[PDB]
Design a protein around this ligand. Structure first.
Ligand SMILES: O=C(N[C@@H]1Cc2ccccc2[C@H]1O)c1cc2cc(Cl)sc2[nH]1
Ligand SMILES: O=C(N[C@@H]1Cc2ccccc2[C@H]1O)c1cc2cc(Cl)sc2[nH]1
Ligand SMILES: *Cc1c(COP(=O)(O)O)cnc(C)c1O
Ligand SMILES: *Cc1c(COP(=O)(O)O)cnc(C)c1O
Lengths: 803, 803
């Protein structure tokens, strides 16, 4: 009955039932007597997949004939989630498939739950790539995503005894209908070896070969008949005896598993192999397609680098042009810089990729030679521009001196790219001011901003059809790919029916999430409570620990004054910790340990509950975000480059409690600061504390309620059977806290009081929500991609449909 | 135009073209502009596959409703070859598909060459399993093949510098249309651990688990609408961090690769794991299906053991019945023996499986306990039957004493089976007389013969349609599944048209094979020469070396008397050597080295050529066997249990030169010895030499032409650049030859003179061929399987069609 889900035409429904039954028979080899639920999911998936094929063939033929400039988005991560619902939405088939399956006696939503996530990313950076593929198709760009087909994605998180456990994410176990292997496009990638010199120049010889086999996945645009491609590479061995065959596993391990580090450089050789594996195969593919003079190469090709992870594209392109195509160095370098552009995602120093020179020398000897030549010529430019500024040369160099000499891969990216961008206004400004100040002064024209975004298909129409419908009832459907049209909703801030309908939808979403938790985990939550949600990867800089301190404050205040009314809350925290990150793992145990006390105190009862949401991932975000009342975005000012979870909550009818960090600043600017719960130190205040020295003891000595909590943690109140369980957390907070948790405690608690005060007035809570939804339009990834296309790639977007 | 290939009906051809184009689009995602040859092969394969589905569903439903006794054929090898042509032949679609592809502008035979062999066997034993699956379907038996889905089959053989090179057989690289994964039937298999005791009895605990995922392949009967199943199991891991995920490879290595030992026991733990892996999963499957008292288990189940490789089925069945179903030991043993039967394939002692007790104790502790209990109770029966015969107890025991104590797996099989059979009359008699004499005296009723056979679908209709057609022109098509009808052909021994037609067909086949060698290897052979062919695995007992001595004899005789006419020959030898088998590898180099001299001597020219056929496998046998004039079957009497290559040559119009060994004896009995080129020691003569001692020097001292050749090998005539290359071959022949090559040299050379003499008379050569083809009917695997069904399994075969 919801119009945004399309038409269920009589001949279309008849045909879908016909083809469903055909696939059940010929493709799954089943009758309705023995057919499993998974069989039914697979039949529907193939039925829907068939509707993509004509469009996919015709799109790629259209690009050959039109011959536009081609866009190549290189990333080690594509955090895609599930594909069935997204495909139906973009092809306008959702209502027809729902009716067809209903008539066959099946519930399509049950079938949808059987699909594995394609969890080929860690967090923000990986999900941005996925939103970008969707927006580039919707805007008619001749764009290709290039990455690795990991056999195992981000690990499955189980919680056992309050602790995170990791299990392999065997996502391909039952087959993936949404990929097509492409045998005729397999290519060789080279490792190790050595450099020699012929009559013609340098030659890379005596290498070990690993084959790269590509798998193509379709990427449908929104109701425009465009289907683009995501190409992911899989490692294959080339071809006593038995051990030799078993040892094929070693080369094949290159594509085995996603490294689960979110913001942290670990420096493993296998990770370096993965990076070169993607780069080498992708660039071969690009050059072949270009051929089917290199002066026009940058007119026909753009390569976008998602962080420094594919930075080897710069020396690899130079290697191919100089050593194989035999261009002169200076010509080849002109071409490389005009082709490549680099996006930076964080300022935290331990995230920076700095590879030991000995490791590169051994694995990629020709690339190290090329990097040294790039460095000499780049520093000669610096020396000419700033004569005698010797320390500037030291700071800007691609080579970092020390006990272990290393290559700074960010420096390599800036030198080899015609554009460098940060991911929100505040971040992009800091790059110019501080972090890459010297580079900005040499080449100011290179530095740009492209504020992040999210797709309103997955993150509104798919996950929250009820909200999409009430919006469409007032302003039509154009907003779905023109999100700034949501500003029309400000005209309904005093409209009784809209106020009613916005609150109705939120409550339906809350009931549905409550039912998921009861069904899947036998966990009961109070449906008449404020849903307070912090979901994102577990990190000190994101300050899940600050949330912890507030939850314990609410508990202690209840115990002090049991008779005083408080707004009931369900506090929900979720996200994965990196397997080797001890503090993050201790923080997860703290959250569950708080719950073990709070959730069983009879004085508290259902006035307060705290729960850890297991296995946070793209499909779970689609469930919980539409149910949220309060969005927790509480990183220390200066630490979160942008964020994108923040945007998802704003679009789905939650109010935000946050710091003036990342894209939070632009969100508040868009809605008006009066409509956001802003608190805590600004960047300028953090910097002032750093100048004098952060002393956590001062805050402990001055704040009675804080002392109480620290003593509870120390003495074993939250770990009775192991009193010293949380000693390391207490020690870090008191003496080694780089993120200043205690310094924002008082403002955070006071800001939360104001949240509860507004929640007591349902009408005014909803009116503030309307003012948020109505001003979320800037955060569409369509806007972001249009900016990349016009300001970096030199192409003009188009929402025109193909026949 | 050949009627045996079926009807090309107008609506059928139209529909096949329609569905071909549909699969090219929806399944391969291609148009006719970019479609690769492999794409076209895959489109035809899916089109043909769709015709199997209804029949497969209906057959297995029919077996549930009818509830017949079920037959389970357990083997570590299924040597299947290619599937496309076989499927078309059995469904009567060959002429229709040929016309459909022709009308689309494609050559179906080109498409057929793209399919990889399923080379999941080594030689005779593995190909017998494959012929048996075909015959059981054609005879309407409710039969299942159970084995392992090896990721890599028998190695790809390359010849480089005259030497065998091994490469991995990556047969699944592009996808296998002819398997269907079955997720809902995945089962756990257990390894290692220890035994403990509860209130109820023994319990196997603390094990390591490996999952077994089944893949089902359809097995079509000949034009009877029956489709049976071959179920092959694949190993899957159950589910710091990164290494833990990589280490999943270790469990998964269980199904990685076929062990390339043909007749030789190597005793590797990984091989033992493979054997238990198949047995455990298969028996779980059997027991579940039985449930969907165990007194009726043998009425509903037969388990056939293809050699001792799945012998662990005996203690595994006892483990399940006693430890899990809680039957008393004696009842469980009644059931086990009535369920199981064992087929023996060779008498060579080094082939016998004798596992160290320590290895079994560690990997399979409960199974070793059960084996010891089986042994005690079995020897108590022997002691009662033959009181005081202490050495008999030692000889019959399942436990073999020594520096390393071992379990004799053949002894385990005889004790735990209600029937034991050899594979040809002479072999089955020797089992009773000598090899298992003591067991025969205890239980004479257990011992049987089942002479081997080959399917006349693959090995006549498929590979030699021209011969199938000229036979059908005279006697109709009933012979195709009633091969004894070939005896009608004796009535045409003086028929001028049939004599003409038999020779015409052979010559067409010879032209086609010559064209294959020119196309694929740029090797030219003389089309007006006798094609002399020895194809089979390389082994001392098969005496490829005796063939070598004869080829050198022909060369030396030509050089002695250049003016004397000799019948031109192309001598062809092919087959694989086990990677660790040094002598077999040296024998391949000898063959190529002879060719390097013979094939370039201008005095010889095209009067004699010797060539090594690379990568002998099922698809290559289908090419060369129909082209052969002379079949070499020259094993030392007493060493080849049966043979089956011998049968393939007889059916396809070649005459045989052989010893009275294996099934050669029964072939000669069927045709009349006057129609076979029989030579050499009989078994009785070999035994007499063994009693006095084989002295090769006597033969060297008495035979001038033999001395010449040995001196040529010794002095470096066939290896000028490395004079001592063949010293080890000479040393073995002169001092350590277990197979008495020199003792059959003179009779072999004289027998070959008689072959050439008959070849000079084309009419009488062809008349002898007719007398061979006409009497090959006994060697149909349909006859073999009917005997297994009636004399061992207790089921009645039926060639009646399903609707
Ligand atoms: O995987 C696909 N086709 C396979 C080709 C092939 C080759 C051998 C055996 C089985 C199969 C098909 O499953 C496939 C078709 C489409 C259409 C899309 Cl859109 S995405 C996609 N994958
Ligand atoms: O492999 C088969 N079907 C696959 C089921 C499945 C599940 C996910 C993605 C792709 C696919 C199909 O290729 C298949 C169908 C038939 C019919 C036969 Cl007869 S043998 C056979 N295999
Ligand atoms: C959007 C998203 C992220 C990023 O959220 P942030 O709060 O901006 O860090 C991480 N994980 C998943 C599953 C997401 O959908
Ligand atoms: C039939 C067959 C065998 C067995 O042949 P023998 O001469 O009896 O040893 C071995 N390999 C292949 C490929 C076969 O087809």
């Amino acid at each position: 009955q919801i119009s945004v889900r399309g038409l269920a035409g009589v001949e279309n429904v008849t045909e879908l039932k016909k083809n469903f039954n055909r696939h059940l028979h010929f493709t799954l080899v089943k009758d309705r007597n023995v057919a499993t639920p998974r069989d039914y999911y697979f039949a529907l998936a193939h039925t829907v997949r068939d509707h993509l094929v004509g469009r996919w063939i015709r799109t790629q033929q259209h690009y050959y004939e039109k011959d536009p400039k081609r866009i190549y988005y290189l990333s080690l991560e594509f955090y895609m989630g599930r594909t069935l619902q997204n495909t139906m939405v973009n092809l306008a088939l959702e209502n027809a498939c729902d009716e067809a399956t209903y008539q066959l006696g099946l519930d399509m939503e049950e079938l949808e739950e059987i699909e594995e996530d394609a969890g080929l990313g860690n967090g923000g950076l990986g999900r941005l790539a996925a939103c970008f593929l969707d927006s580039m198709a919707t805007l008619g760009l001749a764009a290709y995503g290039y990455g690795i087909r990991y056999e195992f994605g981000i690990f499955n998180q189980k919680i056992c005894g309050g602790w995170q456990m990791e299990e392999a994410d065997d996502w391909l176990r039952y087959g993936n209908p949404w990929e097509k292997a492409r045998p005729e496009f397999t290519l060789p990638v080279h490792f190790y070896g050595r450099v020699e010199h012929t009559s013609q120049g340098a030659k890379w010889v005596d290498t070990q070969v690993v084959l790269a086999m590509p798998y193509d996945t379709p990427v449908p645009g929104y109701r425009n008949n465009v289907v683009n491609t995501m190409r992911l590479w899989s490692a294959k061995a080339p071809n006593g005896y038995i051990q030799a065959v078993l040892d094929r596993n070693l080369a094949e391990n290159i594509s085995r598993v996603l490294y689960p580090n979110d913001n942290f450089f670990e420096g493993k050789e296998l990770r370096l192999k993965q990076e070169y594996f993607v780069v080498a195969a992708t660039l071969q593919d690009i050059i072949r397609r270009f051929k089917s003079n290199f002066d026009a190469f940058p007119d026909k090709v753009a390569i976008q680098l998602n962080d420094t992870h594919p930075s080897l594209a710069i020396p690899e392109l130079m290697r191919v042009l100089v050593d194989l195509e035999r261009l002169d160095w200076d010509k080849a370098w002109e071409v490389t810089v005009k082709t490549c552009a680099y996006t930076n995602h964080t300022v935290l120093p331990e995230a920076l990729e700095r590879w030991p020179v000995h490791l590169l020398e051994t694995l990629l000897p020709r690339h190290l030679q090329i990097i040294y030549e790039i460095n000499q010529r780049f520093l000669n430019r610096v020396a000419a521009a700033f004569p005698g500024d010797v320390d500037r040369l030291r700071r800007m160099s691609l080579v970092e001196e020390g006990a272990v000499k290393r290559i700074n891969m960010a420096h390599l990216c800036i030198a080899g790219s015609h554009a460098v961008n940060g991911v929100a206004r505040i971040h992009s400004e800091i790059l110019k001011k501080t972090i890459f100040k010297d580079f900005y002064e040499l080449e100011p024209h290179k530095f740009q901003n492209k504020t992040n975004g999210i797709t309103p298909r997955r993150w509104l129409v798919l996950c929250n059809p009820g909200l999409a419908e009430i919006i469409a009832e007032r302003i039509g459907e154009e907003y779905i790919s023109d999100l700034d049209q949501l500003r029309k909703l400000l005209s309904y801030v005093d409209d009784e029916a809209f106020i009613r309908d916005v609150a109705k939808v939120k409550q339906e979403n809350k009931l549905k999430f409550a039912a998921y938790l009861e069904r899947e985990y036998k966990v009961h939550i109070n449906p008449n409570s404020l849903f307070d949600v912090q979901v994102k990867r577990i990190h000190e800089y994101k300050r899940q620990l600050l949330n912890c301190l507030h939850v314990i404050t609410l508990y202690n205040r209840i115990k002090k004054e049991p008779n005083k009314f408080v707004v009931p809350r369900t506090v929900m925290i979720g996200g994965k910790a990196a397997p080797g990150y001890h503090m993050a793992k201790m923080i997860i145990k703290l959250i569950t340990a708080i719950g073990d006390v709070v959730n069983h105190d009879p004085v508290v009862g259902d006035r307060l509950r705290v729960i850890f949401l297991e296995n946070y991932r793209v499909s779970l975000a689609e469930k919980v975000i539409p149910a949220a009342d309060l969005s927790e975005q509480i990183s220390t000012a200066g630490t979160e480059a942008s964020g994108t979870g923040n945007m998802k909550f704003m679009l789905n009818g939650a109010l935000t409690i946050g710091t003036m960090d990342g894209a939070n600043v632009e969100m508040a600017e868009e809605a008006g600061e009066e409509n956001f719960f802003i608190f805590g130190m600004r960047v300028e205040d953090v910097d002032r504390l750093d100048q004098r020295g952060y002393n956590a003891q001062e805050y402990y000595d001055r704040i009675p309620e804080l002392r109480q909590i620290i003593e509870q943690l120390s003495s074993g109140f939250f770990s009775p059977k192991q009193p010293d369980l949380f000693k390391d957390i207490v020690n870090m907070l008191m003496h080694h806290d780089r993120f200043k948790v205690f310094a924002d405690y008082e403002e955070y608690v006071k800001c939360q009081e104001r949240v509860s005060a507004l929640y007591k007035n349902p009408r005014e809570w909803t009116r503030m929500v309307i003012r948020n939804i109505a001003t979320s339009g800037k955060f569409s990834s369509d806007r972001t991609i249009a900016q990349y296309a016009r300001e970096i790639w030199g192409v003009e977007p188009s929402r025109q449909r193909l026949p």
